[PDB]
RNA sequence: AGGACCGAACCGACUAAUGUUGAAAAAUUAGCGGAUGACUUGUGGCUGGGGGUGAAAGGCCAAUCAAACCGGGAGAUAGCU
RNA sequence: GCUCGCCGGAAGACCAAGGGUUCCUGUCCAACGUUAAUCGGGGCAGGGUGAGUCGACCCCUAAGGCGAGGCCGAAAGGCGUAGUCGAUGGGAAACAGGUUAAUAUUCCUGUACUUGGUGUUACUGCGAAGGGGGGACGGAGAAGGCUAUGUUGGCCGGGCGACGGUUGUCCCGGUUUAAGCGUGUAGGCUGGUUUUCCAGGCAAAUCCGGAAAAUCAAGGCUGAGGCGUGAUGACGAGGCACUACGGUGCUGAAGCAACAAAUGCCCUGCUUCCAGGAAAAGCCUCUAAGCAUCAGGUAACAUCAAAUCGUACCCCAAACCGACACAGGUGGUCAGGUAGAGAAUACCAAGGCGCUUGAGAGAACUCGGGUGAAGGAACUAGGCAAAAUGGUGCCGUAACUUCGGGAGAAGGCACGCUGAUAUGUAGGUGAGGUCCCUCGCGGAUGGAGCUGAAAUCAGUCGAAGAUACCAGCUGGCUGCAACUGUUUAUUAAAAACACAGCACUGUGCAAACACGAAAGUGGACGUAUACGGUGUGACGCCUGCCCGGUGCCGGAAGGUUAAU
RNA sequence: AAUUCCUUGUCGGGUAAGUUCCGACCUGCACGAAUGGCGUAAUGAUGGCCAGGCUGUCUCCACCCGAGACUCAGUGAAAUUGAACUCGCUGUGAAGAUGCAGUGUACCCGCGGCAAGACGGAAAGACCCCGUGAACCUUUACUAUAGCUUGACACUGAACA
RNA sequence: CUUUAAUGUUUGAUGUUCUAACGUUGACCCGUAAUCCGGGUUGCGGACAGUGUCUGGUGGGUAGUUUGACUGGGGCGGUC
RNA sequence: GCUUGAGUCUCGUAGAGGGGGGUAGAAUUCCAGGUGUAGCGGUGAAAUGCGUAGAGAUCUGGAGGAAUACCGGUGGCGAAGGCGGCCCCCUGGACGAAGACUGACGCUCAGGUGCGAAAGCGUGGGGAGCAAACAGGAUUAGAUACCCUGGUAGUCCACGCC
């Protein structure tokens, strides 16, 4: 049985990483929401 | 010519090959090659915009002279080559100053023939001239729509254009569809018809041949569901409404031509 | 030569039995179909929700699909329990 | 420790991804291990990952991403030129031994190789987001030549066998050795040399391309493998001194030949086919702007530099994805012996395990199998399941057919061992010789050795010789779908979908159509033998009648008719 | 007939016996010519039927070999559950009783088994109905609307019949 | 006052010609050792095309919805 | 051996003999336009049909296909089927005066092979007239016909069949 999570740190960083968040204004809104919530890790991918 | 295959297997039962021993066996001319990547069913938005296009064989684009130039320089024709990007064959020609070019090969062209492109060029199959040095009634191919643009008409294999009349600044042409249209007389045209006229005689024999061409399977709207197509649904085979495109426009009849700046150029609509 | 034949790796999933608080939220065992091709597979990319993609079953889109998931309108509304 | 079993195209070895200390040592047994645990992938402490040559970084690009300006868009933003990123691909270079408890092409020893900087000497036209060459490319098939590797013989060392015989054609083990340098060969490709000219390469060019003369078929490029050197080195069966029995050190003999060999190499080759098979840089060459004992380019020598990051360990898994120490999933590489076509299968090598509850006993019943009297589908919805057949060679084989098929149709006969033909044959391989050549990786005759089927006669054993594993049930009549394929990944694999064919219809290119609020993009770097939509669905014979209704196409005379 | 209600139509073959099968008839409820008609070699994990071989499929089961089940030691769940001192029968009863009435039977408590009942467990029945409930789909329902299309005005001017 | 082959002087339908707005997904040059985009030269089309506002038609391609109740279950029938 | 059967050479003659290509002129049809009005067409009679959105008639320009009026003949050629405008290229056969040459090389020929009208079949084109099928209108007692109005395959070209 092939499960849904098949890890790859390159695709992880390209899809959910910090610079992928900072490229779009909506990912910068994601980062603003996570700084306002106070997360220890902004992008847990990174 | 045409070659009917022996039925040693289904898929070879019903295939006719057209084979030309005159075509070059080997690599094409590498200075006139470019990269051709598959992009059908892919917009710059990434959506499929033309359906039923997918993976076929990898192909390389050959830079073919359509706006033929080098007026007054004769060119000898080397071996004819195969072109995947079109139904016609092409010819590698060598000019007298040492320049090789790719030409849409006409019907009678052989290796060693002389071709020329100017206004002083003798009228002969393979030669191109503007249509005021070309007599009325001759069959031409690779004819421009604008003077200097390049050949846009009669580029497929076996196709030709008849020069029917002359206005004095315009030339009336009977096209392969039966349409009569007015084209400016300074537009150039190559004499004769395009070769590989046996291209329509091939039968592919099997679905794999269409897949090597690059044609993905076509699904019928009757086979689809009501959410997918305007046809679709039913507890049997019959839908039972007027046949349409997937986007609702009627597809049997229903002429869809909305151009109004070229109606002055189309003289008689095709039948 | 062949979308050729038999048959391993590989891909799949026709039958039966077991399992059904399973060894497993679809598998095991014994057979089974394809196995040079419309094949199969690694890596990366692209298509985003009345949207995509679909050899078309409303299939699939992260164990979720006749309209994904998350947050919000929101304490929707509920002559019903 | 000695036995026993299991895997052995893995249940062995090495990586990539992924994980992140699980690696090694000391100590502990609370919790975690489906049981105990002295053990552990557990707890707590230390230690452990050494690179110019491996990978990343780096130079270069594919799909694609971002994109100065730009075009477009209420805003956000969309597309996109120059450009700049982006491997899954293309460019410099290291091998063999030894070593640690744990590292290893990194440390040590031996032998190398590459790319730059600087300096000295000798000669000299050097110089580019520019031109050209090259990188640089498909599928299938068939050789030949090899090699990794294996077997046998020789050689060397040891043995002389718990029970009849045995070393005195016996038994066991070893018989290894690389990069680099030199030679440039089984092959493969290609005519070279010189001179003159130019409507071509975004300008120039001595470079590429093209044209015209003389000369001879002899020059060049590529290329496994072999041989020499590396290497009187290392390694090496064993033996010898100290044992806390982890082990340490010294010495270390033969180290050859023949045959069979790959799916690996020559080979990115050759042949053939259509479906016509990346890009750019590194590399070579040519000049443009510029400079002239200058700066540079070559060759030799010397010296310096090659940074930084990763490197432990798991990786058909108890370290990854599955909530688990989960019968599942997970890409690549290596590929021994005997039998065998085989990467099947069986038994074994090297190596790794016995799957983290055991002990009894021998009820029903369940699961997984073995065998069954007589009957042989009477069972059942249905031969479901089981049983059966199963290999090679030869004989033989029907209706029908699209002439290919059907067809392994069906149905039969022989298969073991021994001996002879033939103290090992047909065939394969090829040393000592002998003779030529510009006398070396050369050619010709052999025909010593080594290897070696298949067949025929004769004999012999058992119930049985494809004796195990492995390995097809066969025939007849019909429906449907031509077929191969695809499909509801998780109750439906079908007659459904698709399909090659066929037809209708749209489309004259700034095409139709599609995505898009628009730019733009696909269609397509295509051009009516093309592209889209629809329906039908190989093939054979065909496809009749109806335009009243609803669509569509054509026409505008009349009626009705909007904003104005 | 993947199509036929009557219907297992009728006739023939196959069988001792055949609602299925095969070949016909035509009385086509309600086939029919690219919604394709009829046929068709080969192909099919396709549907139906027949036969040979073969057999535990069966008459009708028997024995054996392993893993459980059983006993012992160690570890150690789950669904469920108002409380229980938790029998049978007949009747009654919100209409199928362990519990009510009458009556019969029954020392107390395990263990291995089987499932007839506890209208057993699981899942606020999916069938049916209801709600002035929802979603999606259809059309010739209503009202809009993207698109396509028609014209007027503007961008948009000058001459000549 | 209904009309005149030069004059005081309008409106509306096609038809022809021109260029000068507009289009150019024709060629060339420059920005620029850029398939974009501008600017320039020229060719072709040309007051057409196309766009904005208004407007008639078409429009399940989408979107919001409606589609009654009684009923010896509901539906059919019937009834209000 | 011979020429006398058969054949060959020299020089000519007539011919729609065959294959390929090009071109010309009447006419039919269609499209665009000018003039012009109420019928055209058809038949034994009509009617379907075309025309009041302008037909038919006349004229101009253009497009496309097929067959070649006269010559034309109780003519010609070819084995038969068959072949008709003109011109070119390639080519087959026949006949004649005269001369030369070879010297029976001849005739027929079952099987075999080739050619073979029209209709028909396959693929790809073309399609002006004509026209099976089909539709309408007549006729008739009926009319699936003869007649009229249309009209598809086909007739035309290339390559294969038959």
Swiss-Prot record, chain A:
A GO term, aspect molecular function: structural constituent of ribosome
Superkingdom: Bacteria
Alphabetized HAMAP family for the sequence: Ribosomal_bL34 (MF_00391)
Gene Ontology CC annotations of this record: ribonucleoprotein complex; ribosome
Source species: Escherichia coli O45:K1 (strain S88 / ExPEC)
Source organism phylogeny: Bacteria, Pseudomonadati, Pseudomonadota, Gammaproteobacteria, Enterobacterales
InterPro entries for this protein: Ribosomal_bL34, Ribosomal_bL34_CS
Gene3D superfamilies noted in UniProt: 1.10.287.3980
Name assigned to this protein: Large ribosomal subunit protein bL34
Keyword Ribosomal protein set for record: yes
């Amino acid at each position: 049985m092939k499960r849904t999570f098949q890890p790859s740190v390159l695709k992880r960083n390209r899809s959910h990483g910090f610079r992928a968040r900072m490229a779009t204004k909506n990912g910068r809104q994601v980062l603003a929401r996570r700084r306002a919530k106070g997360r220890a890790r902004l992008t847990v991918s990174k | 010519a045409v070659v009917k295959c022996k039925p040693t297997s289904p898929g070879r039962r019903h295939v006719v090959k057209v084979v030309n021993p005159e075509l070059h066996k080997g690599k094409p001319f590498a200075p006139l090659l470019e990269k051709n990547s598959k992009s059908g069913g892919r917009n710059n938005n990434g959506r499929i915009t033309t359906r039923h296009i997918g993976g076929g064989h990898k192909q390389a684009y050959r830079i073919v002279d359509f706006k033929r130039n080098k007026d007054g320089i004769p060119a000898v024709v080397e071996r004819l080559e195969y072109d995947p990007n079109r139904s016609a064959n092409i010819a590698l020609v060598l000019y007298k100053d040492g320049e090789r070019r790719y030409i849409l090969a006409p019907k009678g062209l052989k290796a060693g023939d002389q071709i020329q492109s100017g206004v002083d060029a003798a009228i002969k199959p393979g030669n191109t001239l503007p249509m005021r040095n070309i007599p009325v009634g001759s069959t031409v191919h690779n004819v421009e729509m604008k003077p200097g643009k390049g050949g846009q008409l009669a580029r497929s294999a076996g196709t030709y254009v008849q020069i029917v009349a002359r206005d004095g600044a315009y030339v009336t042409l009977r096209l392969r569809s039966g349409e009569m249209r007015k084209v400016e007389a300074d537009c150039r045209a190559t004499l004769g018809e395009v070769g590989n006229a046996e291209h329509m005689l091939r039968v592919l024999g099997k679905a794999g041949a269409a897949r090597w061409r690059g044609v993905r399977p076509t699904v019928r709207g009757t086979a689809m569901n009501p959410v997918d197509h305007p046809h679709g649904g039913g507890e049997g085979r019959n839908f039972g409404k007027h046949p349409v495109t997937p986007w609702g426009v009627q597809t049997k009849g229903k002429k869809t031509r909305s151009n109004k700046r070229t109606d002055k150029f189309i003289v008689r609509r095709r039948s």
